[PDB]
């Protein structure tokens, strides 16, 4: 039938002015474009087939050709930006938006998917899809009393497409579009399907990746407790974006950070900071570093949840990128913490792993650590214990790392480092 047609034969069938011949040829094109390996997208574009496919989207009396052309165009739009542009340039956006109202679920679903690929290209096409009025009919498809009545594949495609409308920066999505989408997104974030939850979390992570005003729009919707819950999911594809969203939120105000703490996030961190997935440990440690950049009462919560030993652990042994986040977490802690909090940090064993990292060939982490040490010495001065600290550092071999850093190429490193030796070691 329609298996392995040449593009030439597809063109012949499409040019026939016989709707059924055109349907067979469009199906043949769909099969080429859906094959496992190397779909001939550029060949199909070069043959001038896009305008015909777009015209077929409007064939209400022939729902099969609407479906086949929708699938063909979805796959062309799944390619490079130039390939996606060819689909947009053919007038596909409003044609697909019209198909959202199709009585045929499999057709409206394909239109949802195609619009997701187009919006996924970047901010410009995202915003163009929004200008053509895609949001109202997309949200209308989810306006049911219980999401569980929808087919799960259908619901997953809608959630994914909505997440692409929330994605990308420079610019971020229109504020009014975000407000319009948020209530449905919150509902999806409470739906019990792992893929819907993952893509909902991804969407929330995009919406919180920005200025405090953007974070506030999300936090105000009361989603933090649900994010904290999903943070404890067993599925890594859910934990990953849930953690990114939580991490994003704590880059915000002290008050936004406090919502995360109030929701119980810190109790999940012993497991996150020891997670066998390197990326999870790194993101969790980055998150901790922004929490220890917070108020003294928020640092105290980190202490009370027993998280300081976990930071000592990550500093002692982790992927180097994670160790650098831990170094940051410590410098922030020592910068904002009380004397008592800083004393507690040393008692937990921070000094030796801090000193061991001074042999890293990374200027930034060296600067960060020297800052922490300086901060810890300033606390020692207030207790008159600079000598005890001076001894701890010498004993673990930290002093002849600091001494050697006096000859380092970077100005801050050699400078801070010189300062430390005269000041506490001379």
């Amino acid at each position: 039938g329609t298996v392995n047609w040449s593009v030439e034969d597809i063109v012949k069938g499409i040019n026939s002015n016989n709707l059924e011949s055109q349907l067979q040829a469009t199906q043949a094109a769909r099969k080429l474009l859906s094959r496992e390996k190397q779909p001939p997208i550029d060949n199909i574009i070069r043959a001038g087939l896009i305008p015909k496919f777009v015209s077929f989207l409007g064939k209400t009396d022939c729902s099969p050709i609407q479906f086949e052309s929708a699938w063909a165009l979805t796959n062309i739009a799944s390619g490079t930006s130039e390939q996606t542009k060819a689909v947009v340039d053919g007038g596909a956006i409003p044609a697909f938006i019209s198909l959202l109202a199709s009585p045929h679920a499999h057709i409206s679903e394909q239109a949802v998917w195609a619009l997701g690929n187009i919006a996924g290209d970047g901010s410009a096409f995202r915003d163009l899809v929004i200008k053509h009025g895609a949001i109202d009919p997309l949200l209308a498809l989810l306006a049911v009393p219980d999401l569980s009545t929808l087919a799960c594949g259908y619901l997953r495609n809608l959630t994914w497409t909505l997440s692409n409308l929330c994605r990308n920066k420079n610019p971020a999505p229109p504020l009014d579009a975000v407000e319009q989408i948020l209530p449905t997104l919150v509902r999806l974030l409470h739906h019990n399907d792992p893929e819907v939850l993952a893509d909902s979390c991804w969407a929330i992570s995009y919406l919180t990746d920005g200025p405090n005003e953007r974070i506030e729009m999300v936090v105000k919707k009361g989603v933090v407790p649900q994010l904290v819950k999903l943070l404890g999911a067993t599925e890594l594809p859910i934990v990953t974006p849930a953690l990114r969203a939580i991490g994003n939120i704590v880059t915000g105000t002290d008050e936004q950070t406090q919502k995360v703490i109030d929701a119980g996030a810190l109790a999940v961190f012993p497991s996150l900071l020891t997670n066998p997935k390197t990326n999870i440990q790194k993101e969790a440690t980055w998150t901790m570093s922004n929490i220890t950049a917070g108020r003294q009462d928020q640092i105290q919560q980190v202490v009370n949840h027993g998280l300081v030993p976990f930071l000592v652990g990550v500093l002692s042994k982790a992927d180097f990128k994670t160790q650098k986040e831990a170094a940051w977490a410590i410098t922030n802690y020592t910068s904002g913490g009380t004397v008592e909090q800083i004393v507690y940090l040393v008692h937990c064993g921070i000094i030796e792993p801090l000193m061991n990292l001074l042999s890293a060939k990374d200027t930034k982490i060296i600067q960060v650590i020297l800052d922490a040490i300086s901060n810890i010495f300033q606390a020692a001065e207030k207790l008159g214990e600079t000598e005890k600290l001076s001894i701890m550092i010498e004993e673990c071999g930290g002093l002849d790392k600091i001494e050697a850093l006096q000859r380092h190429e970077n100005e801050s490193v050699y400078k801070a480092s010189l300062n430390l030796i005269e000041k506490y070691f001379s």
Binding site: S78, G79, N117, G120, P241, T251
Partner: peptide, 16 residues
């Protein structure tokens, strides 16, 4: 302040 800035596919092809 001292706060610091910092796998879903962007596009999907329908196969089979």
């Amino acid at each position: 302040s001292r706060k610091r800035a910092r796998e879903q596919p962007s596009k999907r092809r329908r196969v089979e």
